[PDB]
Design a protein around this ligand. Structure first.
Ligand SMILES: C[C@H](C(=O)O)[C@H](N)C(=O)O
Length: 387
């Protein structure tokens, strides 16, 4: 439909960079880039990788906060078939050691010089601070470098997304270009982001929750705001229209909102995943933001996302986490009839390429994804947990 099959991630950026070069693409605490600017910096970063001889298929590990440079790193890497491995700032050292070694990168990008030193303790790979490598990126940007394309297959890996905690063995979902682009397009076919949306994103891009607000905004030409007591004020002052949430962020927001009768009227949608959103939170979100839809979703990183409750149905089937993503199938398993509980299983062009270098773990979970969650489909195709 609007579903994209066989896509490359960086093509999302090239399109918007040509289609709306002068619209705002990314804002952070420090400034704003238009789509032209994001394209230029992404190209410049691609030349920096070329300059360092990082080849197609190799990984870079990037431990950065939510700032404009990280998005340019993501796209520039994509443009060279290099594998973006985003990690959250503040991981414990031993945890980093384990994950960096598993990811097996060509090099590592850190937040600043103190962080670059801590990283040097835990790997022998080359480690670059973002502020120092960025002086070069800007030179390259000024020289117009990296503008050329290179061969990248839709089947090539774009990203490894680590989901394992400290106390666990390292584990990353291995994400090819095509699946990513497909999943973004399918989510958006349900959610309806568009070019005048302003997305207020408080999730790290190291989580697929934030990564996909980068992708979905880029896909549609929207503006992404990379964002504590001031949350209400931030939302209102950014003119935010779309906001991904998790239940703890939504409770916080409803507490904060009662202290501020100016609200954040520009808000039109909250999209919840990751955990079950209680009714009381939903009610309080609608009360503070009567203009906004509160949309329930459910997913796993293994296939990005599984179900979305269509916005227009937000008041119905209160126990459901919605319908399958458009272009995908949910089956309950030996296929069971409707209403019969069983394991939630998922088939489609969003199902990712397994876990990175872990045939054994991959075998149990994976062309069909077994979520290890249990529930049923009602008569109409809607998904529920339990019975
Ligand atoms: C964020 C969710 C999760 O795995 O917790 C899922 N990746 C989703 O986007 O719906």
């Amino acid at each position: 439909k609007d579903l994209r099959y066989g896509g490359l991630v960086h093509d999302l950026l090239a399109d918007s960079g040509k289609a709306t070069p002068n619209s705002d693409a990314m804002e952070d605490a420090f400034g704003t880039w238009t789509y032209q600017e994001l394209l230029n910096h992404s190209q410049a970063f691609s030349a920096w990788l070329d300059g360092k001889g990082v080849a197609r298929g190799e990984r870079i590990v990037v431990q950065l906060p939510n700032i404009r440079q990280t998005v340019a790193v993501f796209y520039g890497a994509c443009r060279r078939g290099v594998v973006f491995v985003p990690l959250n700032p503040g991981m414990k050292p031993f945890h980093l050691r384990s994950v960096i070694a598993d990811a097996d990168p060509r090099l590592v990008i850190a937040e600043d010089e103190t962080a670059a030193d801590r990283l040097r303790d835990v790997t022998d790979l080359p480690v670059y601070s973002i502020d120092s490598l960025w002086a070069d990126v800007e030179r390259l940007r000024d020289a117009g470098a990296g503008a050329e394309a290179v061969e990248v297959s839709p089947e090539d890996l774009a990203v490894l997304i680590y989901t394992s905690g400290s106390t666990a063995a390292p584990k990353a979902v291995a994400c090819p270009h095509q699946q990513i682009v497909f999943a973004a397009s399918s989510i958006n076919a349900v959610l309806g982001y568009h070019a005048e949306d302003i997305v207020f994103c408080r999730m790290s891009v190291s989580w697929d929750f934030g990564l996909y607000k980068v992708l979905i905004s880029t896909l549609t030409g929207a503006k992404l705001v990379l964002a504590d007591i001031a949350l209400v004020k931030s939302l209102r002052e950014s003119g935010a229209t779309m906001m991904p949430i998790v239940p703890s962020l939504a409770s916080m927001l409803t507490t904060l909102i009662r202290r501020d009768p100016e609200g954040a009227p520009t808000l039109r949608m909250f999209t919840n995943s990751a955990a079950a959103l209680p009714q009381v939170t939903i009610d309080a979100l609608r009360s503070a933001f009567p203009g906004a839809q509160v949309v329930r979703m459910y997913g796993q990183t293994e296939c990005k996302r599984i179900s979305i409750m269509p916005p227009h149905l937000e008041h119905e089937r209160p126990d459901s986490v919605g319908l399958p993503l458009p272009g995908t199938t949910i089956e309950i398993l030996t296929l069971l009839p409707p209403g019969e509980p069983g394991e939630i299983t998922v088939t489609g062009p969003h199902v990712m390429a397994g876990y990175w270098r872990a045939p054994e773990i991959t075998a149990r979970a994976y062309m069909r994804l077994h979520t290890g969650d249990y529930g049923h489909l009602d008569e109409d195709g809607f998904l529920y947990f339990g019975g």
